[PDB]
Design a protein around this nucleic acid. Structure first.
Ligand code: DGT
Ligand code: MG
Ligand code: MG
Ligand code: MG
Ligand code: MG
Length: 342
DNA sequence: GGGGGAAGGATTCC
DNA sequence: ACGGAATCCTTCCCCC
C-alpha cells in the first residue's frame, strides 16, 4: 500500500548548540528569544531534556525558566545556524527517497514505499538513517514508521527521544480506539474542547456522530480529516511543500499607538523580510499587529503586480494607519507579511 | 444560486 | 507571553 518513514530531530536547537560547543552536553540548556522589553523578557524556543525535566520548555517565559533553573545555560536563538544544519540533514534523507516532504525545520516525511518491502526492512532503513545522520552531523533523531503520514508522526512522538518505532496495521487499529483524540496532529485545545462536548474522546468516537454535526462544530476540513483517520482510510500523499509567505514581526520596547514610534520597528521588519524574500516578488502585503492584550489584528492589500520595497514601505504605513484608526488598543508587536509571489 | 477572489481572523505547532 | 508560516472558515463583493 505505502510505508512512511518520518524523522524529527531531537531538542533540535538546543542540540545544535551542543554540537557547536560540546562542553554544554550534560548541562541543562535553554535557547531563548529575548523580546527586549527588559532583562530576560521573552520566551523559550526550546530546551534540552536535562532542563525539560523540571518544566523548562518551549513557550514559557525565560524569567520563569530562570526561577526554576537559575544556573542553566541560556543561549539566544540563532535560527540561521540551525537552518543550515537542517538543510544538510535534509540533503542526506534525500539519499533514501526522492519522495520527500520537509514539514518543518526539524521534521520531514519520506515515502519509502517502492524502496523497501515490509516493516522489518523499513525499520532497518530507519536505523541506517539514524546512524548515518549521527555520523555526519552528530545529531540524534527519532524515527516513526507507518502506513500514512499522521501515524508515522505519532509513532515518533511515542518513540522520542533518540528512538525509532513502527506502528503496524494491527496497532493502527488499536490506536484508533486507544489514542486520545488530542494526541492527534492538528488537534489543539480549541478543537479538543469542542470535541469533548460531542463526547468524542477517542478517534473511533467520531465514527458515531452525524457528519453534519461534526462539520457544524469543527468545520468540514477538520471533520473529513478525522473521520478519515478513524476509518483507517487517511492517505494524503507525501509532497514537497512550497513557501507561500515570508515575513517578520518584532516586539517594541514599549507598547505604543504613536506612528513615529512604531514606524522604525515596521521598517526594520520590512527590511529583514526583503533580504529573506531573496529573488522572490510578492503581490500581496499584510501588516500585522499584536495589541497590548496579545490579540492579533491585520490589514493588507493585493496589487495587480509585484511590490517594490518603495511600494511596501509606503503601503505598510497606510495599513498601519488603518489599524490604529480601526482599533483603539495599543500595539505591542508590529510586523509585515508578504505573499502571492510571482 | 453559485463561481472566484480578496480580506480579516481563527487555530495549529507541522 | 516569541514568533514563522500553512490551512481553513466566515463575510463581503462583483457578476452572469
Ligand atoms: N522560537 C521558537 N521555536 C520553537 C517553538 N516551538 C518549537 N520551536 C523550535 C525548537 C525545536 O528545536 C524546533 C523543533 O521543535 P519540536 O516541537 O519538534 O521539538 P524539539 O525537536 O525542539 O524537541 P523534541 O526532542 O522533538 O521534543 O522547533 C516556539 O514556540 N518558538
Ligand atoms: Mg524535534
Ligand atoms: Mg518537529
Ligand atoms: Mg494536541
Ligand atoms: Mg513542538
Amino acid at each position: 500500500h505505502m510505508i512512511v518513514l518520518f524523522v524529527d530531530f531531537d531538542y533540535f536547537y538546543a542540540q545544535v548548540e551542543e554540537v557547536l560547543n560540546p562542553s554544554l552536553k550534560g548541562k541543562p540548556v535553554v535557547v531563548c528569544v529575548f523580546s527586549g522589553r527588559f532583562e530576560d523578557s521573552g520566551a523559550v524556543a526550546t530546551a534540552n531534556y536535562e532542563a525539560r525535566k523540571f518544566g523548562v520548555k518551549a513557550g514559557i517565559p525565560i524569567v520563569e525558566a530562570k526561577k526554576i533553573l537559575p544556573n542553566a545555560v541560556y543561549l539566544p536563538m540563532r535560527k540561521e545556524v540551525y537552518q543550515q544544519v537542517s538543510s544538510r540533514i535534509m540533503n542526506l534523507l534525500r539519499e533514501y527517497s526522492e519522495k520527500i516532504e520537509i514539514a518543518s525545520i526539524d521534521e520531514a516525511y519520506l515515502d519509502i514505499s517502492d524502496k523497501v518491502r515490509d516493516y522489518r526492512e523499513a525499520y532497518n532503513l530507519g536505523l541506517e538513517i539514524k546512524n548515518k545522520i549521527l555520523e555526519k552531523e552528530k545529531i540524534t533523531v527519532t524515527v516513526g514508521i507507518s502506513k500514512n503520514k499522521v501515524f508515522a508522526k505519532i509513532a515518533a512522538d511515542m518513540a522520542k527521544p533518540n528512538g525509532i518505532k513502527v506502528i503496524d496495521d494491527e496497532e493502527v487499529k488499536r490506536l484508533i480506539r486507544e489514542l486520545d483524540i488530542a494526541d492527534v496532529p492538528g488537534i489543539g485545545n480549541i478543537t479538543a474542547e469542542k470535541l469533548k462536548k460531542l463526547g468524542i474522546n477517542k478517534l473511533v468516537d467520531t465514527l458515531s456522530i452525524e457528519f453534519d454535526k461534526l462539520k457544524g462544530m469543527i468545520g468540514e476540513a477538520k471533520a473529513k480529516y478525522l473521520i478519515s483517520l478513524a476509518r483507517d482510510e487517511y492517505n494524503e500523499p507525501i509532497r514537497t511543500r512550497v513557501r507561500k509567505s515570508i515575513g517578520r514581526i518584532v516586539t517594541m520596547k514599549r507598547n505604543s499607538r504613536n506612528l513615529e514610534e512604531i514606524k522604525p520597528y515596521l521598517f526594520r521588519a520590512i527590511e529583514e523580510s526583503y533580504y529573506k524574500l531573496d529573488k522572490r516578488i510578492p503581490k500581496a502585503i499584510h501588516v500585522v499587529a499584536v495589541t497590548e492584550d496579545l490579540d492579533i489584528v491585520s490589514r493588507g492589500r493585493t496589487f495587480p503586480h509585484g511590490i517594490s520595497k518603495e511600494t511596501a514601505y509606503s503601503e505598510s504605513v497606510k495599513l498601519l494607519q488603518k489599524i490604529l484608526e480601526e482599533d483603539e488598543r495599543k500595539i505591542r508587536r508590529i510586523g509585515v507579511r508578504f505573499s502571492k509571489f510571482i
